[PDB]
Symmetry: D2
Subunit: 213 residues, 4 copies
């Protein structure tokens, strides 16, 4: 089971390269997770709130056991992640994640590319104030795949919310336990707390999976 | 507060008119709701599971009080509903709902039009077996509007799920209480139990709203 | 073949009813079409440009013959139309069209419902200045169905474009000629010229279908 | 102006790595383009038709001059490409392209990741037979950006079409000529001819941009 982790996010936003590095910890018992990342290429020219999702589901447990992400982590077999975020704005944000495991410690390597954010939009003018709490709907179409969709919003300075949809496809190296594949769909409620500057982002995340309420 | 209700759904599916009528009850205390509807134009030529959403949020309470739908019902001012469902298939299903209130009794008049369902698709061949439990994400952009989006699925005979997205816009006659507008987003978990024949559909629905978990 | 037509559009926008009536003509030889409509319930509280699409494809010819819409008009069998427009805004606009034929004269009865347009948005503040020329992609999934999708935009006062996607499903009473079903996809380029006041909208539309270029 | 080019596409599909290499030529005068690519990691486990778009708009001229892509190529300043393809299936395909210019010769480096393709779907079972001709709608939101959206389809063995939407965001290093930014929207009609085996794909593409018809 995962106890600590580190990340390296690299790529570009509107054609401008950026690079983040940092580390944190988490409780595989309750899904809580926290991390701090810092830019290695100067101040970020975009809102830090779009990096939130791009900055460890292996910490997520399920009601009756481990989540497929957590089991694949404990297992060492792991999984790869392909995430697509489409903003009401027309902007696109793609994420490709890969992980490495070593005795409770996770090393994440995330390639993130974002484009089409309007120059006068909430993202480029850093008008987003936070990430709204969200609930993801997850399905397991086959024993090696998890699909998660989220209706996402970030409040802006002007009070209006900035909308987007997240679609994340997880591809596992080893078959997911028959126990897990049995309960579908699985929903995940998330909350985040963010404190950030121009070159540093601090995140606290809470995750809670459920099949019934 | 609502205690009983009745519905009249009319319109067409793939150009073929249909008409449903029926009544039921509900518990405004826990969001439970049940109803039975019957066709008045012969056997239904399409899966009954697409009618589920089209067959009363006024029964939905909130953790700290009434839901805007329930408050508008208790109030008598009410609201109108504009629903759009888009299936992975390419099929479209539009719903326009209007209600009438009379001492705890609700009368619903729903105009529903569906089109583009493939002749060999799950809907026209009645291959859907049920409606998967779902969680809706609701926001209140202004004091007279509620927007609810849902990632929806219905299992089929072949085991694969049939996907769709629901987008429902609620327009209220009177401003929604400042108390409600304060907590956003609001999520609603729903479960349904369906027993149906060619000209009769019986539905039991459970709804549970939550802001935190 | 159609030579003249009239329309009656009714329904509501953001819960506020509206009603339009008017007539015009068209050239079934080149797809040109023109019409004038006037409100019967006072000044329109929303941009007239969203009514453009809602204000006669039977005038549309194909390179090698008639379009399925035109053939169904000449035939008298006709077709029904289910249109869904989703704006980047979150606003939804549904259209249900039905026609009547009488010796080259078409009578249209359009039920249009729109909702979720932000009070400060381009539509409610009438900031749209025109409808951009567009190209629709049409497919015929079966002999009684035509599906048309369009990436649509309207320029605003602020210079930025307001985006939407149109999805229109056409259901025919009689099978579409095998000749037509043979050439897919079929694209339709459209241009519009609009002159409008608070209670009157004048439209000139040019349509040109093509399979190759 | 570009006369010849070569490509290197690498990445993965459903977690399985793949790598393509090849070269071709094109006519910057008419937008025609052709290329041959071969796998360097064994037979491809997926339909070659999804690689078509992933296998040079710099060859595209405009009616009144060069296309922004072609001008940036002739210029040497270039542009980067961020493409997102979403299939009706739920599958996602992301593309990140970068180019290099050297006296009429273009070298492309494309990172392509695809996920969520059903094991029994048209892509994984190689049931696609071709790419349908298409028309893209392009806009230039600012002097350094081009956004292109396409309603895309590929016929399958079973006769039904497999649907997807392509969204491509182009970010330029230098401002696009005022002349070009003046005419919007710009549409691009494309046709492809494909001959392919398990480790080799041959493509012929025809492109034609237009503002008016």
């Amino acid at each position: 089971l995962p106890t600590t982790h580190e990340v390296h996010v690299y790529g570009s936003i509107n054609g401008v390269e950026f690079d983040l590095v940092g580390s944190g910890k988490g409780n595989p018992k309750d899904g809580s997770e926290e991390i701090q990342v810092k830019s290695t290429k100067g101040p970020l020219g975009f809102s830090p709130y779009i990096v939130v999702p791009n900055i460890f589901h292996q910490y997520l447990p399920f009601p009756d056991g481990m989540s497929p992400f957590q089991a694949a982590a404990d297992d060492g077999s792991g999984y790869v992640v392909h995430r697509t975020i489409q903003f009401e704005d027309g902007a696109s944000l793609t994420g490709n994640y890969r992980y490495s495991y070593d005795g409770g410690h996770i090393k994440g390597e995330f390639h993130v590319v974002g484009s089409g954010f309007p120059a006068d939009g909430p993202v480029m003018t850093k008008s987003l104030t936070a990430v709204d709490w969200s609930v993801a709907t997850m399905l397991f179409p086959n024993d090696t795949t998890v699909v998660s969709t989220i209706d996402w919003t970030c409040p802006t300075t002007s009070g209006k919310r900035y909308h987007a949809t997240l679609r994340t496809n997880y591809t596992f190296a080893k078959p997911i336990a028959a126990t897990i594949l049995q309960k579908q769909p699985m929903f995940v409620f998330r909350k985040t707390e963010v404190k950030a500057s121009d070159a540093e982002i601090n995140l606290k995340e809470w995750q809670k999976a459920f099949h019934d309420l």
